[PDB]
């Protein structure tokens, strides 16, 4: 599993759950919301080199034409598998919001 | 939609369908597949700019920061959305096998 | 930045109007969106708005029940659907951006787009 | 909120001041209430922002002042083409209300 456990207790250069934080305002431009102020969303990066956390049979089959020919640049992805929401906090006037904005953070990578 | 219809018939740089025909003995080293000889397999490949076809929030989200700062590499990859199955015809002896290979084929891209 | 809406509309009455508003790319994604309609010789009144990014519309009481402001993801565009039209809501709709917040002063307008409801 | 716009018209000549008051019918604090400029046929233009803040580009001789439930937009020198329907707007409470409007004529 490409998860924190592995990830970031580990060096990896392929395909791996890599650390980020986002600042709302800073690194975004959204100055609508109150709470939290950013968050630790996280992002999926490396190589994806054969049969390395393969999602499905045309992963499993690309990984192999990749590593075969290169050149092509058909090389599978690095990307997200498991996620989780985050709840945040914004006002409409003097009014407080609960809202709960789905598949914000990332757990878990694949390659697809 | 990022498939054949859209990304066969114009030019993109972005994350768009690319066509890829696989061949089983030239190209991965298969030598037991009769029928076919291989494949329009295809892939996703190209930039994950600004609310380009994403795939979930994080994505959305990502495209955004990555267009902030590039140098995080927190980029949403170009990845497979509908995927096919191919059939395959193989002999064990003077036996016909037909097998139908689920997701060996891509039709539509992401930004994931 | 500049908000370019849909041109001008005719609807028979019952009916329903969407009208569109396109913006400068990144106004999208940092910012909200507030619908205003004028109504012949008269003042403002607010009907709701949109966060773009996220699609969390808030409308004010006398609105919801008729209106629906949405946003295309892609287009860079916000929608705004008024429907069983009457001749009453034969005004000037307009989108605008707003300073930071949900509720805020709305700093850039777009043209307008008249609605007349008529047979 | 209500938001009771006076005089319902104001005749000046260019050069005067001008002094619109907007009296809402709760607190609205110091930094939620908006002033507009609307000549005909074109949008609203936003000049004042938190009772007091120019808006970006707007002519130093618009100002405005005011906390909780009375607040004024001051127009000096004016020009011509500062005729035309002021507005305030609210936003401390949803849902955004507006005022009824101000005209300013030319006086003869």
């Known amino acids: 599993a490409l998860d924190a456990a592995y990830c970031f207790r580990n060096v990896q250069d392929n395909c791996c759950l890599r650390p980020l934080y986002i600042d709302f305002k800073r690194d975004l431009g959204w100055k609508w919301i109150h709470e939290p102020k950013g968050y630790n969303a996280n992002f999926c990066a490396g190589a994806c080199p054969y049969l390395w956390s393969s999602d499905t049979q045309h992963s499993r089959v690309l990984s192999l034409y990749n590593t075969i020919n290169p050149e092509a640049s058909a090389s599978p992805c690095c990307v997200s598998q498991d996620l989780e929401p985050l709840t945040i906090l914004y006002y409409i006037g003097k009014t407080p919001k609960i809202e709960q904005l789905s598949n914000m953070i990332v757990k878990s990578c694949k390659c697809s | 939609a990022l498939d054949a219809a859209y990304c066969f018939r114009n030019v993109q740089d972005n994350c768009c369908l690319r066509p890829l025909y696989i061949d089983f003995k030239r190209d991965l080293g298969w030598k037991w597949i009769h029928e076919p000889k291989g494949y329009n397999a295809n892939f996703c490949a190209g930039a994950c700019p600004y609310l380009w076809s994403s795939d979930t929030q994080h994505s959305r989200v990502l495209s955004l920061y990555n267009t902030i700062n590039p140098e995080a590499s927190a980029s949403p990859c170009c990845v497979s959305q509908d995927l096919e199955p191919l059939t395959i015809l193989y002999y064990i002896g003077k036996t016909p096998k037909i097998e139908q290979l689920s997701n060996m084929i891509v039709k539509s891209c992401k930004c994931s | 930045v500049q908000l370019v809406q849909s041109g001008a509309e005719v609807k028979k009455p019952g009916s329903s109007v969407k009208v569109s508003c396109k913006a400068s790319?990144?106004?999208?994604?940092?910012?909200?969106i507030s619908w205003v309609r004028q109504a012949p010789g008269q003042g403002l009144e607010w009907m709701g708005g949109?966060?773009?990014?996220?699609?969390?519309?808030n409308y004010a009481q006398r609105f919801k029940g008729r209106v629906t402001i949405t946003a295309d993801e892609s287009t860079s565009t916000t929608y705004m659907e008024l429907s069983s039209l009457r001749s009453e809501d034969t005004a000037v709709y307009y989108c605008?951006?707003?300073?930071?917040?949900?509720?805020?002063?709305?700093?850039?307008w777009g043209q307008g787009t008249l609605v007349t409801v008529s047979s | 909120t209500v938001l009771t716009q006076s005089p319902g018209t104001l005749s000046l000549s260019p050069g005067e001041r001008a002094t619109l008051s907007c009296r809402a019918s709760?607190?609205?604090?110091?930094?939620?209430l908006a002033w507009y400029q609307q000549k005909p046929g074109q949008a609203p233009r936003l000049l004042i922002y938190?009772?007091?803040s120019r808006a970006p580009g707007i002519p130093d001789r618009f100002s405005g002042s005011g906390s909780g439930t009375d607040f004024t937009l001051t127009i000096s020198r004016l020009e011509p083409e500062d005729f035309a329907v002021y507005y305030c707007?609210?936003?401390?409470?949803?849902?955004?209300?507006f005022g009824q409007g101000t005209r300013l004529e030319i006086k003869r």
């Open positions: 605008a951006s707003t300073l930071g917040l949900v509720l805020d002063a709305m700093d850039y």
């Open positions: 790319g990144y106004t999208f994604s940092s910012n909200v």
């Open positions: 949109v966060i773009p990014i996220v699609d969390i519309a």
């Open positions: 709760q607190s609205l604090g110091s930094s939620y």
């Open positions: 938190g009772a007091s």
């Open positions: 707007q609210q936003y401390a409470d949803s849902p955004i209300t």
